[PDB]
Design an enzyme around this catalytic site. Structure first.
Site, PDB file in Angstrom:
ATOM      1  N   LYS A  63     -22.942   8.817  18.481  1.00  0.00           N
ATOM      2  CA  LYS A  63     -23.896   7.963  19.212  1.00  0.00           C
ATOM      3  C   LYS A  63     -23.616   7.896  20.718  1.00  0.00           C
ATOM      4  O   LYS A  63     -24.507   7.601  21.487  1.00  0.00           O
ATOM      5  CB  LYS A  63     -23.975   6.568  18.605  1.00  0.00           C
ATOM      6  CG  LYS A  63     -24.304   6.558  17.082  1.00  0.00           C
ATOM      7  CD  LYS A  63     -25.629   7.183  16.789  1.00  0.00           C
ATOM      8  CE  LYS A  63     -26.073   6.934  15.346  1.00  0.00           C
ATOM      9  NZ  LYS A  63     -27.534   7.297  15.193  1.00  0.00           N
ATOM     10  N   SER A  82     -19.582   8.328   6.612  1.00  0.00           N
ATOM     11  CA  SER A  82     -20.618   9.332   6.867  1.00  0.00           C
ATOM     12  C   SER A  82     -20.002  10.743   6.929  1.00  0.00           C
ATOM     13  O   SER A  82     -20.615  11.719   6.463  1.00  0.00           O
ATOM     14  CB  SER A  82     -21.327   9.057   8.190  1.00  0.00           C
ATOM     15  OG  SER A  82     -22.212   7.981   8.038  1.00  0.00           O
TER      16      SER A  82
END
Length: 291
Positions: A45, A258
């Protein structure tokens, strides 16, 4: 002729590839991981956050005294907090109060201000606050639908360079779709044999190809446009977590759930006979925290 970053935001991206030697369990394809946990604030991100801010600066929406405002549940807040601090912007984040205390403290360490809510609460609070002061700017994805996400192009080019054009399968989280569809858009023209596989999280254990809803305000969030994606592999949280643990103890790679899910998917792909001998690049987007 010197190599010195002007600020920490200039060290976002350029993340390394590392071969996975044990957790693939004797697969006949090569699996190599792209370590997005090496970004300055620990996740993929960082790329998305800085690209949104860079674009806003270029557009003239961010002045020296603008306040950065964003609804978030996870790593996008950390990314924005780090970029805002490095660039000297005040940063306000709205989020559900389920958010881990550890994450709250990290955001606060960067100087971010946290407006906590019981998510649409987060989104609605942000939008309400933006009306209160024209200094507030809410970063958003900005690319024309015909174009790949700007952070995806950079990721793509790194993959292309570091594999000398030999990447055969690229494996990444569904996320907001921008990364996997963007890398597919860039690389497919150059490598018509390449496959692009998105990885989707599911509950503890759980199969059939399906549209996936994204995130948004209201009851009907838009569906993710995964047109250039060859396949979606959906991975149960138990499987994801077990591979994340094995990565730490068997590869020395401390990564998040993830990342565990992505590796499960890459290992699966790596054992299909039609994929023997291929180079499979798998994005590990996040750092470890559950431990």
């Amino acid at each position: 002729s010197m190599t010195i970053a002007e600020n920490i935001t200039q060290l976002i991206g350029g993340t390394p590839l590392v071969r996975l030697r044990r957790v693939t369990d004797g697969a006949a394809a090569d699996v190599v991981a792209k370590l997005e946990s090496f970004n300055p604030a620990g996740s993929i991100k960082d790329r998305i956050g800085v690209a949104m801010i860079d674009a806003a600066e270029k557009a003239g929406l961010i002045k020296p005294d603008t306040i950065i405002l964003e609804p978030t549940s996870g790593n996008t807040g950390i990314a924005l907090a780090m970029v805002s601090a490095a660039r000297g912007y005040k940063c306000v984040l709205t989020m559900p109060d389920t958010m881990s205390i550890e994450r709250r403290m990290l955001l606060r360490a960067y100087g971010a201000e946290l407006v906590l809510t019981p998510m649409a609460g987060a989104i609605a609070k942000a939008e309400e606050l933006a009306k209160t002061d024209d200094r507030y700017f809410i970063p958003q994805q900005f690319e024309n639908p015909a174009n790949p996400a700007v952070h995806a192009v950079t990721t793509a080019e790194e993959v292309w360079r570091d594999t000398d054009g030999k990447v055969d399968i690229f494996v990444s989280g569904v996320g907001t779709g921008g990364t996997i569809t963007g890398v597919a858009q860039v690389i497919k023209q150059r490598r018509p044999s390449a496959q692009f596989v998105a990885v989707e999280p599911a509950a503890s254990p759980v199969k059939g190809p399906h549209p996936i809803q994204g995130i948004g305000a209201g009851f009907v969030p838009p569906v993710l446009d995964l047109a250039l994606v060859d396949e979606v592999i959906t991975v149960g949280n138990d499987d994801a977590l077990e591979l994340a643990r094995r990565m730490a103890t068997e590869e020395g790679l401390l990564v998040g759930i993830s990342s565990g899910a992505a590796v499960w998917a890459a290992r699966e792909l790596a054992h299909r006979p039609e994929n023997a001998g291929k180079l499979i690049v798998v994005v590990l987007p996040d750092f470890g925290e559950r431990y």
